[PDB]
Amino acid sequence: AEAMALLAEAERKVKNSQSFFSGLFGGSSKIEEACEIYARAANMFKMAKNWSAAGNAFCQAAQLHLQLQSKHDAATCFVDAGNAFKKADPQEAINCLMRAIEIYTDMGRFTIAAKHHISIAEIYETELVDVEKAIAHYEQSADYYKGEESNSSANKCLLKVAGYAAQLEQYQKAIDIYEQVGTSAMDSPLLKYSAKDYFFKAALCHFCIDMLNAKLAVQKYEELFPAFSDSRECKLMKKLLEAHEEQNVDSYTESVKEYDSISRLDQWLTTMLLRIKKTIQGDEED
Amino acid sequence: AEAMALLAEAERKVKNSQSFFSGLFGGSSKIEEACEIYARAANMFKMAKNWSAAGNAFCQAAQLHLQLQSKHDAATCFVDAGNAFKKADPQEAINCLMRAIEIYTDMGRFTIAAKHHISIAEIYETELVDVEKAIAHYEQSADYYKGEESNSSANKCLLKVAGYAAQLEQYQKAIDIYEQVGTSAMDSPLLKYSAKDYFFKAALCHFCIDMLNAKLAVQKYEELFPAFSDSRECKLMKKLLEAHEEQNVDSYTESVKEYDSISRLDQWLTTMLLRIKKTIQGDEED
Amino acid sequence: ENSIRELHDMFMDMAMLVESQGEMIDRIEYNVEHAVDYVERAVSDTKKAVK
């Protein structure tokens, strides 16, 4: 219960012994008791809905637990310190997880480093928006997930790179990413149906390109075009290529006049719609 | 061959001794042997179809482990004791599920705490009808599931809150729930075809809320009104709440069946529909 | 259209059901490596408790 007395009785109990207090063995029993109690204390603040004070209570517990010698669960206390300000409003969970991930990889490990590097990336994408750094976090983290054949996040965090990167700034990465996912997507008997929208994303990114480079993917890809769900990928394209190439808008726009009913359009698709018609503006708008 | 002998034989041995029976050591190996006898006893009580002394046997088996070194497998035995009297009719299990909460909540294990904190409300509503405490535990547990950001566990709690805020008739809080959860869902393809279900669930929660918030929450949630389950929400709602503004129940009751012709109604909706139909009727007299 | 509506009922059931299951998969995502984060980390000290 004590929000303060566990602290006050442990702060007078944390001290290095070169004195009459030294004696025979260390005070590692004392700081072990203290850090277990700090863990309970950061629990009682989080139970009391104090995720800032609780999160800082995790921060002392999480930093002081390394002082005996415990890098094992000090990483867990770092994640708990991160989860508190991740749940609470502000930042500084970013530092709890950057203290976490380096120490976790310093154990001789790979996975959870990436599994919270994505957490920092989610914060720096959604919340503490630093997408030019979060996308690097997805990138290096997906490099770790690639080097462990955890193909899930290996494809996923790359998709998070490319879906925002293409629209904002990186163009050859768009098709290079959606082809790297697309080949091994065609490989597995589990994956080759997810490849349809993956090559849709490879195609409909136009990179200031007026061409049928999407049709280069058509006469590349294993569509099996009697599968009509790729006609919402490329017959869409077989209209709009020549709509954009004949600088025409009442066929290009008509494609989504009919395609909005047969497919709900999210923000990224309509932003790419607006992207290719900014290329149409640059073809038409004087 | 039953464990009623095992309980008394370990109860001879459970003494807190001050004699040569301790000597210098206690009964540590002896009391682990004893708690193993209680473990075996409490298992074969459930094996013997007892269901009433069995969960008591788990209670006591854990009870003689609580004060030793570790409440932890004793806490799991309390979880098992909560799984003991739950199938049975007695209420002893809920108390053991409290004991598990103030071990796992007390220790930092909010995850498993939230795993059975929901089952407590499942018993306070389904079995042991105390539904305002059931709802207070769905809400509290959803606060915990949002503590670790496990969202849809909390949303599955919030339907039992909010869906049972209809018959508890706090419509003002029913519409306070589906907004922040469903406007968070249009970015998710995971639930977007479901999200408009929730803004039928937001929309039809009337205490006769005749503001254009119902005409605007359908718009902030950007929603193609020619969506074909929003045809089953939006223009449905237009006929349902224009006829109320016509003060004319007959074409209302014909068109609610016209909705039944194209999407059959279920319990929570149908009950709220006859509810709001009472409001429409009691408004059309005067 | 009614027959396709019947299968459409079974399919909105299907897809939103497996959707809802995806949250139990989220609790797996907890209990798949946090389970490792306890276990492998504990055996990093029991295997080294021989030291």
Added chain:
Amino acid sequence: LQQTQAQVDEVVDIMRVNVDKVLERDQKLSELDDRADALQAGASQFETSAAKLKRKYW
């Protein structure tokens, strides 16, 4: 139209085969939780037991 009626009603029954699946889906989604929840404590407490062990036999 009736050719398509027969085809589509076969596909009603393909969805009924998905209904034959979905109980086998959901029960297994249940029992895998019914193991993972119970696995969590046995996974959790073993590092604590390791700490209890290794303070002595240096």
